[PDB]
Structure formats: structure tokens, C-alpha cells
Amino acid sequence: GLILKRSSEPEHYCMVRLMADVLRGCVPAFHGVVLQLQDLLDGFDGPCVLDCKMGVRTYLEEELTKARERPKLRKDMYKKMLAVDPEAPTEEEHAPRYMQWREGISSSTTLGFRIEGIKKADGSCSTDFKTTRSREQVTRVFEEFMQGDAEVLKRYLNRLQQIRDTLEISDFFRRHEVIGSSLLFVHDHCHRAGVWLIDFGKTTPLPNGQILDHRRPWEEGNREDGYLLGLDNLIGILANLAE
Ligand SMILES: Nc1ncnc2c1ncn2[C@@H]1O[C@H](COP(=O)(O)OP(=O)(O)O)[C@@H](O)[C@H]1O
């Protein structure tokens, strides 16, 4: 039971180091370049899955610089910033920003994480959470996803606390930008449950010896991502649901 990504570099490398970091248990086991990863669904019966995009900012600060010169005008995304609302400029109307617009209507800006999608035992799938922003709304999606199973919620919380601790002493995590990865929640009707970090497509190293705090606000040079601020809240939201 395995899975093959489509190997990119910041990820292969992100993987060649995680299998050597204290975070090894918090991510899919990596199995060389024969990308050969562990299938996190293999141990469940009818897998229920929820992918949480963790972070205050969802684009590499570097993608913003490189974007300051060359334009990336995709007309599809602007079909996106319109059919949702008129917030779009007269310049856009007639011709990163999308992502940072997505962060505000979403939950990434007010609590560093955002629900990307869900898969059920057989309720198929949904990615319709673009405006899920408030804490009450986040809980509602989680509350439904769990279906009253308190044993699953207990296990998800215990794992989040354990992940949080590992992240705080991880030197790898410490020396990196990490943007666009997710916390993938998985559980089944057998009460089985697990949580892992995935997506190391973005995630880059900082200057010689420089480190990130992962909780303070981002400013042009910070390269800060607010990842732990997102985890602090996600845990907060699940601990209250536990009542
Ligand atoms: N190791 C894995 N085991 C099982 N399912 C996975 C695994 N990695 C990814 N998935 C599934 O693939 C989706 C996208 O993976 P991700 O790394 O985020 O790809 P991309 O970077 O193209 O978005 C996840 O939300 C999840 O449903």
C-alpha cells in the first residue's frame, strides 16, 4: 500500500530531511526515488478524510517578488474573483493577489489554517469551503465530519497536541518557510483515527543559520508563515467541540 507524488525538488529534498528529523512520525513514510510515499488511507475501512491547508499566508514570499516583475494573469482565477463577488480591480476587470483574496474570504488570515476539502465513507467528496471563515463555521464542518464520534475527536486532539510538541523542537521545521502543506485528518467507522503533515511542494530553507518563529505576523522579509498560529487555533476549535 503506497502512492507516487510527481517528484518536484523542494519536496524530494523536504522528504530526504524529514525522514531524518524528529518529525518523521508526523509525515508519510518516504520510500526513496524508485516519489514513493506511504498511503495514509491503507489502514482504514471506509476512510473519512479532511484536508486542512495550514498557514497565515499561502504563497512563497519569493513568488511575490518574482511576481513584482513578470505577470502570472491566468483568466480562470479572475473568473474565480468575480463569480464570487465584485471585489476585482477595473484593471483586472479589463485585462498571489488571488491567493491573498482567497485567504481573507477563507479562514487562512484570521486563524492560520483553512479547510480545503473532505471525503466521506461514501458521501463522495466536497471542496466547497471557500467562504468557511469563522470559528463557528469551522467547528460546524468538523462537527459534521465526525458525526458525533467522541473517540475519534479524542484521538485527533491527542495527535494534534503531540504534533504541536514535535513541531516546536524540530530543527528542520525551524529552518524553513513551509507554505502550502496540509494537516490531513483520517478516520473510519471503527473509531480509528490519524493526522499527518503532507505537501512539501512549497517549504524552503531560510538564510545562513536563520530561524523562523512560525507564530508572529508576516512582513516583506519575515518569511514568517504563521503555521503554529494556525495549529494553536485548530486545536482550540477541536477542544471546544469536545463539549
Ligand atoms: N501519502 C498520502 N496518502 C494518502 N493520500 C494522500 C497522500 N498524500 C496526498 N494524499 C491526497 O492527495 C491530496 C493532495 O496531496 P498534496 O500533497 O496536497 O498535493 P498537491 O500539492 O498537488 O496539492 C490530499 O489532500 C490527499 O487527499
From Swiss-Prot:
Residues 76-84 are annotated as: Calmodulin-binding. GO terms for cellular component: cytoplasm; cytoskeleton; dendritic spine; glutamatergic synapse; nucleus; postsynaptic actin cytoskeleton. It catalyses: 1D-myo-inositol 1,4,5-trisphosphate + ATP = 1D-myo-inositol 1,3,4,5-tetrakisphosphate + ADP + H(+). Disulfide bonds: none annotated. ATP binds at K5, Q38, D39, L40, D51, K119, D199. Activated by calcium/calmodulin. GO terms for biological process: actin cytoskeleton organization; cellular response to calcium ion; dendritic spine maintenance; inositol metabolic process; inositol phosphate biosynthetic process; modification of postsynaptic actin cytoskeleton; phosphatidylinositol phosphate biosynthetic process; positive regulation of dendritic spine morphogenesis. Its EC number is 2.7.1.127. It is found in: Cytoplasm, Cytoskeleton. Keywords: ATP-binding, Calmodulin-binding, Cytoplasm, Cytoskeleton, Kinase, Methylation, Nucleotide-binding, Phosphoprotein, Transferase. Substrate binds at K53, R74, P96, R97, Y98, M99, Q100, W101, R102, K202. The keyword Kinase applies. One of its GO terms (molecular function) is inositol hexakisphosphate kinase activity. Catalyzes the phosphorylation of 1D-myo-inositol 1,4,5-trisphosphate (InsP3) into 1D-myo-inositol 1,3,4,5-tetrakisphosphate and participates to the regulation of calcium homeostasis. Belongs to the inositol phosphokinase (IPK) family. This is Inositol-trisphosphate 3-kinase A. The lineage of its organism: Eukaryota, Metazoa, Chordata, Craniata, Vertebrata. The chain holds residues 203 to 458 of 459 of the full protein.
